[PDB]
């Protein structure tokens, strides 16, 4: 996965590959890069 700013996508048990950015200071669900 090629992230926008380079921020991490992780598999949570909820069944979501989440995107969180320390530059964004926020937790977003789906790939922002799409």
């Amino acid at each position: 996965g090629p992230l926008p700013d380079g921020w991490e996508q992780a598999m949570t048990q909820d069944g979501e590959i989440y995107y969180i950015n320390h530059k964004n200071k926020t937790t977003s669900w789906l790939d922002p890069r799409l």
Binding site: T12, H22, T27
Partner: peptide, 12 residues
């Protein structure tokens, strides 16, 4: 819905 809070990132 809300995902996990603003957090440093998880792998397992």
């Amino acid at each position: 819905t809300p995902p996990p809070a603003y957090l440093p990132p998880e792998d397992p």
